[PDB]
Design a protein around this ligand. Structure first.
Ligand SMILES: *[C@@H]1O[C@H](CO)[C@@H](O[C@@H]2O[C@H](CO)[C@@H](O[C@@H]3O[C@H](CO)[C@@H](O)[C@H](O[C@H]4O[C@H](CO)[C@@H](O)[C@H](O)[C@@H]4O)[C@@H]3O)[C@H](O)[C@H]2NC(C)=O)[C@H](O)[C@H]1NC(C)=O
Ligand SMILES: *[C@@H]1O[C@H](CO)[C@@H](O[C@@H]2O[C@H](CO)[C@@H](O[C@@H]3O[C@H](CO)[C@@H](O)[C@H](O[C@H]4O[C@H](CO)[C@@H](O)[C@H](O)[C@@H]4O)[C@@H]3O)[C@H](O)[C@H]2NC(C)=O)[C@H](O)[C@H]1NC(C)=O
Ligand SMILES: *[C@@H]1O[C@H](CO)[C@@H](O[C@@H]2O[C@H](CO)[C@@H](O[C@@H]3O[C@H](CO[C@H]4O[C@H](CO)[C@@H](O)[C@H](O)[C@@H]4O)[C@@H](O)[C@H](O)[C@@H]3O)[C@H](O)[C@H]2NC(C)=O)[C@H](O)[C@H]1NC(C)=O
Ligand SMILES: *[C@@H]1O[C@H](CO)[C@@H](O[C@@H]2O[C@H](CO)[C@@H](O[C@@H]3O[C@H](CO)[C@@H](O)[C@H](O)[C@@H]3O)[C@H](O)[C@H]2NC(C)=O)[C@H](O)[C@H]1NC(C)=O
Ligand SMILES: *[C@@H]1O[C@H](CO)[C@@H](O[C@@H]2O[C@H](CO)[C@@H](O[C@@H]3O[C@H](CO)[C@@H](O)[C@H](O)[C@@H]3O)[C@H](O)[C@H]2NC(C)=O)[C@H](O)[C@H]1NC(C)=O
Ligand SMILES: *[C@@H]1O[C@H](CO)[C@@H](O[C@@H]2O[C@H](CO)[C@@H](O)[C@H](O)[C@H]2NC(C)=O)[C@H](O)[C@H]1NC(C)=O
Ligand SMILES: *[C@@H]1O[C@H](CO)[C@@H](O[C@@H]2O[C@H](CO)[C@@H](O)[C@H](O)[C@H]2NC(C)=O)[C@H](O)[C@H]1NC(C)=O
Ligand SMILES: *[C@@H]1O[C@H](CO)[C@@H](O[C@@H]2O[C@H](CO)[C@@H](O)[C@H](O)[C@H]2NC(C)=O)[C@H](O)[C@H]1NC(C)=O
Ligand SMILES: *[C@@H]1O[C@H](CO)[C@@H](O[C@@H]2O[C@H](CO)[C@@H](O)[C@H](O)[C@H]2NC(C)=O)[C@H](O)[C@H]1NC(C)=O
Ligand SMILES: *[C@@H]1O[C@H](CO)[C@@H](O)[C@H](O)[C@H]1NC(C)=O
Ligand SMILES: *[C@@H]1O[C@H](CO)[C@@H](O)[C@H](O)[C@H]1NC(C)=O
Ligand SMILES: *[C@@H]1O[C@H](CO)[C@@H](O)[C@H](O)[C@H]1NC(C)=O
Ligand SMILES: *[C@@H]1O[C@H](CO)[C@@H](O)[C@H](O)[C@H]1NC(C)=O
Ligand SMILES: *[C@@H]1O[C@H](CO)[C@@H](O)[C@H](O)[C@H]1NC(C)=O
Ligand SMILES: *[C@@H]1O[C@H](CO)[C@@H](O)[C@H](O)[C@H]1NC(C)=O
Lengths: 412, 186, 183, 49
């Protein structure tokens, strides 16, 4: 069975690349500024150093993960004015320069469907009574979009060349012509079925746009990394209110009632319980950050292989045969738009492995012997298109009546 | 109602018990410090980042000597800026872009540039370039070069071992006898 | 090195005991009070081992994650030729060279880099004998003197024959067909 | 001076109080033990590392 017709479809994929950078300060999370509390944690050990060095290392590799994925662009390229490249409407994937937030209309929907501690926004730099803080990333969201806009504008006017090396000027139908050839089919089909391909391309763009406009799911990978880091901090906050088996959860209710000899006994047990929850939170963030780099190592591969090239692996970059790939930005993650090729509408006929002609057995250089009831000819396995059996495309070697399935026909 | 609490167990806002005015409480100031240096070879001045604070209270506590820790030889030096990271002190603002030398936060980096001194600037992503578009022409490479790039990655680790009684006991007899009540934890 | 230094330095931590030395506590205090305070030290020192052992287990996983990457990447590129983009070096991979290292491996990836790009005017097909002649390989270019077919990895002219050009579909179907005569 | 210390706070060398002959102190002896066997199916004899 060999397919005849086809359609192209754009299936999206997401993954996290980034955990939110945290930091803490025992001197504030352990004590709440009690001086005698500060003088009894010393007598345990400078464990504070190990903690600070542990969280900053976990935090610093979140900026490494983000540059490893996005920052594969050597030059920022401008947004071209023409966006109907041969009919291919590219206004949704590109940023809108008429807006103040120069993001793509996809990324507008990507931000909205995705989106206890001190933080500073704007610029109202408020603080909390707890020792927790979140840190803003080095590579800001506008800079993230600026890497993303170069990957899309650069693909729209340089294409295959954009990731392979120096970006080369080339018409977009020519870029399709080399990409469509690369999957094992003849590049006449793009010129033959241009408006059909252009409409099926613009179909799945609007399909993704309406899918992400009304969705309740498919962004569960991104929001889970947001929620899992949020539920670690809530556990870390709420155990401050626990006694940890001491007389009180407040250091100024221990030293108040009890005399300072026995107060420092109860202060030790309240500090030690607060140290263990602080130390375990560091180990939990240490495991979860090592989990995310495996997705960041996937995203670093899947951008340089799929956006900056053309992928030939099975089910990599969606299902089908891969043609293009458009990256999009997400909070703590990336979004891909994989344009794949789907053959369709198969038909039955009878095939054969060899033709006997003048005492020799003839074999196709590529393709199969195709008999549709009328005559024999050769076509390819991914599209039904006849080729007359000549010795130009039929490899000639060996004798007739040796291979199983040699059929008397005529080769011209 | 006499006072309010936050989403944690802390009382963030109180009413005046005398004149009934409602007063928020802010946790006056704290945070971390990083040291931004060009290295001991290239210079001897350093820049400090007072993390996640309003510079109004930082510059006040410098002159009011309300800082812990404090240095005996220290000055603000008329170079203080409030970014999202906090208060960078000891670096001049530069309003153009370069490549990121030492990362600070929120797109801002720093380096030791020509007046040399420590300056703060915004990170550039790359050149303002362009890929022209044609409907008729393809640029095709003619000459070429080769290049050999090296990469490097560990495949092993300095594998260790730890004996218990030379660590937790120091071969004392009493430590070995308490250790029986913990079992084969070793 | 930092993992062993932490394991060393917390031998001298008091952990809230009377001292950090078991010999001081055996000498100074009574066998009840000595046994209490050395029990306080024995659990602080066990926790320091358990923390060290755990963080060795984490970095033993990451190094096995790179060692399984390097054993693949050696088989992919040293023992063969890669076809993945930017895997084993930036550009077009030719071969690679393994070199030993005290705790790892260093590769030397030999890559191809094109340059010196020149403008050429292009079009999809040639309308000869009323037939849309598509290039079997490469693209059609006109250099200002001759129409010919060249590759995109490098510029090299070839005469337009039916051995590197074929027809699927007649003319007036493709937009932009060359109106030239070929062999 | 009376005694020396290592890079960590362990006394590795003591000057003699009587003769002032300075003397290093090594650990007494310790280490791990391993046992080589061809299997109980094959022999009853083992080699010890
Ligand atoms: C660091 O802390 C200092 C603490 O003093 C803080 O300075 C204060 O900021 C607020 C917020 O801008 C200022 O309040 C405004 O001041 C301006 C001019 O003084 C007025 O025009 C404002 O009135 C309008 O705005 C109000 C809120 O938007 C409206 O409710 C009102 O009806 C008016 O329309 C408002 O009074 C305040 O004056 C300063 N204080 C000083 C001494 O400058 C600073 O903002 C903090 N740093 C950062 C980066 O936020
Ligand atoms: C493979 O399958 C695809 C199925 O998607 C098929 O493509 C379709 O072909 C039909 C006929 O060629 C297209 O239908 C027409 O498309 C044009 C495009 O603008 C419309 O304007 C047409 O509407 C007019 O004509 C109608 C019928 O005369 C009138 O009733 C109407 O009022 C309008 O005047 C008409 O819809 C169809 O659009 C495409 N599909 C796509 C997505 O382009 C293709 O032919 C198949 N190929 C093979 C080799 O089997
Ligand atoms: C395509 O690119 C090639 C480079 O990848 C080009 O080959 C280069 O061509 C230039 C001339 O255009 C040569 O330059 C000359 O080289 C000689 C020799 O230099 C060597 O010897 C001296 C003395 O020992 C030493 O000091 C140098 O470092 C070199 O080791 C010089 O004497 C000349 O002054 C001049 O610089 C290059 O040498 C040559 N490269 C190689 C590897 O041969 C090629 O020409 C390009 N082709 C086109 C069509 O553009
Ligand atoms: C555009 O490309 C064509 C080739 O596709 C170029 O034509 C080539 O011009 C060179 C000029 O030196 C010719 O080389 C000479 O040919 C003679 C005759 O065979 C030979 O005896 C000489 O030793 C020398 O090799 C070459 O034949 C010719 N090729 C063709 C197919 O005509 C043309 O010059 C290019 N345009 C520009 C502006 O460079
Ligand atoms: C404690 O101190 C006393 C004096 O400071 C030491 O006694 C003297 O030690 C020196 C060498 O240690 C002796 O010199 C040697 O004497 C022997 C025989 O007398 C001779 O064979 C050697 O060639 C060398 O001359 C010295 O005589 C000796 N004097 C006396 C009165 O005993 C003593 O050695 C120190 N204790 C220890 C344990 O070293
Ligand atoms: C390509 O898609 C864009 C949408 O991204 C189309 O632009 C819209 O056109 C309608 C018709 O006037 C306007 O009402 C909308 O406001 C436009 N959208 C935006 C975001 O401005 C555009 O028309 C499409 N191209 C073609 C040729 O139809
Ligand atoms: C099977 O495929 C062949 C093409 O190789 C078809 O043969 C041609 O059919 C058209 C019209 O159907 C005729 O005008 C040609 O003269 C035929 N050429 C040859 C060489 O036979 C054939 O029609 C197909 N079979 C069926 C049942 O449609
Ligand atoms: C294809 O044609 C050849 C003619 O050369 C047939 O080969 C003959 O087969 C018969 C058996 O039916 C033998 O008795 C002849 O000796 C064969 N001829 C030669 C020259 O060897 C062959 O049978 C035909 N194929 C089919 C399927 O009928
Ligand atoms: C491309 O060349 C063909 C000739 O091979 C041109 O075809 C001629 O078209 C005109 C009208 O456009 C007719 O009057 C002639 O009779 C045609 N020639 C032949 C031999 O039939 C064609 O017009 C050319 N295309 C362009 C755009 O100029
Ligand atoms: C082809 O034949 C197979 C079995 O004979 C059957 O499964 C299938 O429905 C047929 N398809 C068509 C298009 O006739
Ligand atoms: C305290 O007394 C003064 C007058 O002496 C009055 O103004 C004030 O409201 C009183 N406080 C309260 C809480 O009623
Ligand atoms: C130190 O700086 C000098 C320039 O003043 C330079 O020549 C030298 O190589 C540097 N050394 C190191 C170790 O960086
Ligand atoms: C091709 O581009 C040129 C300018 O580069 C333009 O004038 C021309 O109209 C374009 N061709 C078509 C068919 O639109
Ligand atoms: C090719 O043409 C463009 C504009 O048409 C020009 O900017 C570029 O420099 C040209 N390159 C060469 C190699 O001629
Ligand atoms: C190993 O043990 C089996 C019994 O389980 C015995 O039959 C066999 O002989 C033994 N192997 C040798 C080499 O003796």
């Amino acid at each position: 069975a060999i397919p005849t017709n086809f359609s192209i479809s754009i299936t999206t994929e997401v993954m996290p690349v980034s955990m939110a950078k945290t930091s803490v300060d025992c001197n504030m999370y352990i004590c709440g500024d009690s001086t005698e509390c500060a003088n009894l944690l010393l007598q345990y050990g400078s464990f504070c150093t190990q903690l600070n060095r542990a969280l900053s290392g976990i935090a610093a590799e979140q900026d490494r993960n983000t540059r490893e994925v996005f920052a594969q662009v050597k030059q920022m390229y401008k947004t071209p004015t023409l966006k109907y490249f041969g009919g291919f409407n590219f206004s949704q994937i590109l940023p809108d320069p008429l807006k103040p937030t120069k993001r793509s209309f996809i990324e507008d929907l990507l931000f909205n469907k995705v989106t206890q501690y001190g933080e500073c926004l704007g610029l109202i730099c408020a603080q909390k009574f707890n020792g927790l803080t979140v840190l803003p990333p080095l590579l800001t969201d506008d800079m993230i979009a600026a890497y993303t806009a170069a990957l899309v504008s650069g693909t729209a006017t340089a294409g295959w060349t954009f990731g392979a090396g120096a970006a080369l000027q080339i018409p977009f139908a020519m870029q399709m012509a080399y990409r469509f050839n690369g999957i094992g089919v003849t590049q006449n089909v793009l010129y033959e079925n241009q408006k059909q391909i252009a409409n099926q391309f613009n179909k799945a763009i609007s399909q993704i746009q309406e899918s992400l406009t009304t969705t309740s799911t498919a962004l569960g990978k991104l929001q889970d990394v947001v929620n899992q880091n949020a539920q670690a901090l809530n556990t870390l906050v709420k155990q401050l209110s626990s006694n940890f088996g001491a007389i009180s959860s407040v250091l100024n209710d221990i030293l108040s009632r009890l005399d300072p000899p026995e107060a420092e006994v109860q202060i030790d047990r309240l500090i030690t319980g607060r140290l263990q929850s602080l130390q375990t939170y560091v180990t939990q963030q240490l495991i979860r950050a090592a989990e995310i780099r495996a997705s960041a190592n996937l995203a670093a591969t899947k951008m340089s292989e799929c956006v900056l090239g053309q992928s030939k692996r099975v089910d990599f970059c969606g299902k089908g045969y891969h043609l293009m790939s458009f990256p999009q930005a997400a909070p703590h993650g990336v979004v891909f738009l994989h344009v794949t090729y789907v053959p369709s509408q198969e038909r039955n006929f009878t095939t054969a492995p060899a033709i006997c002609h003048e005492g020799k057995a003839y074999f196709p250089r590529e393709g199969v012997f195709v008999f549709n009831g009328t005559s024999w000819f050769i076509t390819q396995r991914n599209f039904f298109s006849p080729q007359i059996i000549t010795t130009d495309n039929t490899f000639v070697s060996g004798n007739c009546d040796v291979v199983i399935g040699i059929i008397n026909n005529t080769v011209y | 109602q006499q006072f309010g609490r936050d989403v944690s167990d802390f009382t963030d806002s109180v009413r005046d018990p005398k004149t009934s005015e409602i007063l928020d409480i802010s946790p006056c100031a704290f945070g971390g410090v990083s040291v931004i240096t060009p290295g001991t070879n290239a210079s001897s001045e350093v820049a400090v980042l007072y993390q996640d604070v309003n510079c109004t209270d930082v510059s006040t506590a410098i002159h009011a000597d309300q800082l812990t820790p404090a240095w005996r030889i220290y000055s603000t030096g008329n170079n203080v800026f409030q970014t999202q990271a906090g208060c960078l002190i000891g670096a001049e603002h530069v309003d153009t872009s370069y490549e990121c030398d030492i990362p600070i936060g929120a797109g801002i980096c720093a380096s030791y540039h020509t007046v040399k001194s420590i300056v703060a600037y915004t990170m550039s992503l790359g050149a303002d370039s362009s890929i022209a578009y044609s409907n008729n022409t393809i640029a095709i490479p003619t000459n070429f070069s080769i290049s050999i790039t090296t990469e490097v990655m560990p495949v092993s680790m300095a594998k260790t071992s730890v004996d218990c009684n030379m660590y937790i006991c120091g071969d004392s007899t009493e430590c070995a006898n308490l250790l029986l009540q913990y079992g084969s934890f070793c």
